[PDB]
Design a protein around this ligand. Structure first.
Ligand SMILES: N[C@@H](Cc1ccc(I)cc1)C(=O)O
Ligand SMILES: [Ca+2]
Ligand SMILES: [Zn+2]
Ligand SMILES: [Zn+2]
Length: 275
């Protein structure tokens, strides 16, 4: 797998930050900063050669969108998906929650095209709307995916909050092959990981219909323990993300090292699991 350039991921976050500032301070469902976020991500994918689909739904009286991006080619009967919710709460720009996962997934999709990769499995990336309303976009996708297409899914990888400023390195303890893939990447860095428990994200509708899932998380409102600060640094007794769901979930609310490592781990897992 390629090394995902941290600067490229950070540049997507800058664009999402400007989109929030240009649209009332947020990227929330039913508000213009969300569709503007979709438009940015979709244009990058279209230019890289993806087949993109805007999947519309209505929730709360307002139109929502999921953005689906299929990389042409690969085994139609073995589809590997990766995704991230692209909405924020209305209090702020949602840069860690979840610009971080959205940007890592986008940069991995662009890296596939830059590398000339032809995965054996068909790759499909997704950016979900209305996750903050209760997983509404990812539930809509799974609810509207015919059972014959559901059975073609080899896995769903989820990235939701992966740049927390006082990070831990959590790996979902779900499908064993996906989990092993992520833990192997972190072992090569000599960075320990822990099982995710803090978390309620967009892998749940896939997990609940038997699709193998996994993912990465760096923590939200829970407090980092003394033991976790000893293994990862940062500040014991402070939240992993002191700006969770806050107006201060801005460009300053990112730990570059965690964003870089989790973005690189995302690309590692997508390459490994697709061929
Ligand atoms: N989905 C939450 C943040 C979150 C990430 C990962 C897990 I696992 C659980 C929760 C939100 O959007 O606020
Ligand atoms: Ca990198
Ligand atoms: Zn989130
Ligand atoms: Zn959230």
């Amino acid at each position: 797998a390629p090394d995902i350039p941290l600067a490229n991921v950070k540049a997507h976050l800058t664009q999402l930050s400007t989109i929030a500032a240009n649209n009332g301070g947020n990227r929330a469902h039913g508000r213009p900063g969300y569709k503007a976020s979709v438009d940015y991500v979709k244009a990058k994918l279209d230019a890289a050669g993806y087949t993109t689909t805007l999947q519309q739904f209505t929730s709360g009286g307002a139109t929502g969108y999921n953005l689906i991006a299929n990389w042409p080619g690969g085994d139609p009967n073995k589809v590997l998906m990766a995704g991230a919710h692209l909405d924020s709460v209305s209090s702020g720009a949602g840069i860690n929650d979840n610009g971080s996962g959205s940007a890592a997934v986008l940069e991995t999709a662009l890296a596939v095209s830059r590398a000339g990769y032809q995965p054996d499995k068909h790759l499909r990336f997704a950016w979900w709307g209305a996750e903050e309303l209760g997983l509404i976009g990812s539930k809509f996708y799974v609810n509207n995916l015919p059972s014959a297409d559901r059975s073609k899914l080899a896995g769903y990888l989820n990235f939701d909050m992966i740049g927390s400023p006082n990070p831990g390195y959590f790996v979902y303890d779900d499908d064993p092959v996906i989990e092993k893939t992520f833990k192997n990447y972190f072992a090569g860095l000599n960075v320990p990981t822990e099982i995710e428990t803090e978390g309620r994200s967009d892998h749940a509708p896939f997990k609940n219909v038997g699709v193998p899932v996994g993912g990465l998380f760096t923590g939200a409102g829970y407090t980092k323990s003394a033991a976790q600060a000893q293994k990862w640094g940062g500040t014991a007794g402070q939240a992993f993300d002191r700006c969770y769901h806050s107006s201060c979930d801005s460009l300053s609310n990112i730990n570059d090292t965690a964003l870089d490592r989790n973005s690189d781990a995302a690309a590692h897992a997508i390459w490994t699991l697709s061929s």
